[PDB]
Amino acid sequence: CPLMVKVLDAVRGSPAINVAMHVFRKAADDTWEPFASGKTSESGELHGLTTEEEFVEGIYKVEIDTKSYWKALGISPFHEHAEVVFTANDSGPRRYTIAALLSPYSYSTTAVVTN
Amino acid sequence: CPLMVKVLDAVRGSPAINVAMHVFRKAADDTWEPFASGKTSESGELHGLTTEEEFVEGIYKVEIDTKSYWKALGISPFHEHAEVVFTANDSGPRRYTIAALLSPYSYSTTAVVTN
Amino acid sequence: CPLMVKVLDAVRGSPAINVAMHVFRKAADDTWEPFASGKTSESGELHGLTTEEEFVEGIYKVEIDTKSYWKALGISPFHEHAEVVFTANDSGPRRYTIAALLSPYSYSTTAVVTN
Amino acid sequence: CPLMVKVLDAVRGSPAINVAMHVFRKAADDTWEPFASGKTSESGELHGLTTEEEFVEGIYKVEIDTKSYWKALGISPFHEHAEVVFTANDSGPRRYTIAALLSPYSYSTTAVVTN
Ligand SMILES: O=C1c2ccccc2C(=O)c2c(O)c(O)cc(O)c21
Numbered sequence: 001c002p003l004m005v006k007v008l009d010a011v012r013g014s015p016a017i018n019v020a021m022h023v024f025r026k027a028a029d030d031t032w033e034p035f036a037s038g039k040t041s042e043s044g045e046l047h048g049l050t051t052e053e054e055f056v057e058g059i060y061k062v063e064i065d066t067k068s069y070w071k072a073l074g075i076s077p078f079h080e081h082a083e084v085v086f087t088a089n090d091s092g093p094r095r096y097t098i099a100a101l102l103s104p105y106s107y108s109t110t111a112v113v114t115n
Numbered sequence: 116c117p118l119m120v121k122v123l124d125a126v127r128g129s130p131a132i133n134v135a136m137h138v139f140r141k142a143a144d145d146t147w148e149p150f151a152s153g154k155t156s157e158s159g160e161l162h163g164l165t166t167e168e169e170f171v172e173g174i175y176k177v178e179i180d181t182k183s184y185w186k187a188l189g190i191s192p193f194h195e196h197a198e199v200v201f202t203a204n205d206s207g208p209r210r211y212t213i214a215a216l217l218s219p220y221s222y223s224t225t226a227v228v229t230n
Numbered sequence: 231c232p233l234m235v236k237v238l239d240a241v242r243g244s245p246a247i248n249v250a251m252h253v254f255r256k257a258a259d260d261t262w263e264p265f266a267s268g269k270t271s272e273s274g275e276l277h278g279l280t281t282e283e284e285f286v287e288g289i290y291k292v293e294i295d296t297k298s299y300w301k302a303l304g305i306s307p308f309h310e311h312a313e314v315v316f317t318a319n320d321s322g323p324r325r326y327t328i329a330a331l332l333s334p335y336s337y338s339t340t341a342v343v344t345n
Numbered sequence: 346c347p348l349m350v351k352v353l354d355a356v357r358g359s360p361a362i363n364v365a366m367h368v369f370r371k372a373a374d375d376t377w378e379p380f381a382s383g384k385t386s387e388s389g390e391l392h393g394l395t396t397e398e399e400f401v402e403g404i405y406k407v408e409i410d411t412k413s414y415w416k417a418l419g420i421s422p423f424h425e426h427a428e429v430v431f432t433a434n435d436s437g438p439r440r441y442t443i444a445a446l447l448s449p450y451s452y453s454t455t456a457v458v459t460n
Pocket of ligand 1: 351
């Protein structure tokens with residue numbers, strides 16, 4: 001599991017459950033090609049997006065559908081989605097955890113890169 | 116100033132100066148059209164991006180070029196840029212301040228929306 | 231204004247108005263002596279807490295009463311308050327802006343230090 | 346394990362390892378009584394601070410020694426420590442995770458409260 005995404009809800013102090021997200025890889029034409037997708041579990045985590053062999057160096061975008069999450073809770077959010085755009089690099093550590101902390105008008109995202 | 120962006124550097128405890136950013140607006144064909152661009156001042160603020168007349172309702176993307184900022188400082192960061200995507204002026208004209216707080220492996224973005 | 235505090239509300243996307251805060255300075259006996267206090271304005275800012283002459287070197291604690299803020303709004307938050315503790319003016323006089331971004335279960339605080 | 350603390354480093358994009366912290370419980374005299382302490386592991390987590398029977402309702406303070414963490418890395422931080430002050434409440438979910446995201450001039454803290 002080279003890539004895992006964890007989403008937290010700062011209003012309720014909980015994992016953000018059933019949050020959909022799509023991962024894209026930047027192609028040579030500079031368009032975003034679909035790569036992987038899924039929805040967070042009861043723990044707010046999405047595991048199994050990709051494999052080591054598949055996740056090669058390149059630029060990736062994780063598009064988290066935060067608007068649908070907030071609307072399902074009856075809250076009107078600011079952002080259309082949360083976007084995390086980054087280069088995967090073999091010179092560094094092996095495993096990427098992308099964390100996203102969600103509020104209606106704010107979000108933060110953090111990368112924890114380990115071996 | 117219907118749209119203003121302020122950027123802070125969490126490593127130095129300072130405004131983030133000379134941060135470039137590009138604003139796009141979603142066209143009717145669902146492509147991102149260039150809207151405005153600029154760089155932050157010594158206060159870390161970018162004013163004057165647009166006018167009330169030109170900033171119509173739509174979906175806007177503010178791409179803050181954080182990697183270029185960190186690389187100019189000799190730091191290799193995680194993200195390519197920060198991408199703030201939002202619907203603007205759907206209730207009528209509003210004033211938007213987008214704040215961004217930058218660290219090499221993490222950032223947060225917040226919107227202050229006033230009438 | 232050697233010390234200023236700005237507070238934002240990540241749920242409403244607005245300045246956090248009427249947030250009370252109490253500033254303390256560590257005395258020679260290692261107890262927290264009351265230093266200054268105030269509340270944020272409609273802009274979410276608190277100015278005029280102290281003067282250059284009175285804000286000497288020391289360890290300061292800014293206690294932002296976030297629970298009182300959220301409870302006045304009918305939200306039960308996690309934290310009692312946010313506590314920002316720092317050494318000030320150890321290199322000579324500086325200007326400090328303490329920013330705080332509030333959600334019910336999360337907050338961040340950042341310092342901008344200028345000479 | 347009713348209480349767990351996780352600390353992340355936003356400069357290196359890593360768990361913050363060997364971060365010391367002390368937990369205090371507010372006594373009836375309104376003084377902070379030592380409760381538990383430890384240091385984060387290689388995963389940035391501190392487990393086993395307390396037990397269900399011991400962690401009764403009341404106000405607790407987690408004081409994370411962030412200054413020593415940054416100084417050990419050769420970086421001059423703003424804050425003396427990070428402070429998380431909160432009420433433990435039996436009316437809510439059973440397990441508390443306190444997360445802290447550290448930068449030299451900024452930190453965020455989040456509570457994830459689950460069953
Ligand atoms: O709460 C957070 C959290 C809060 C604000 C920013 C980042 C994180 C974060 O990265 C994070 C993790 O990586 C994690 O593994 C468990 C967490 O609870 C968090």
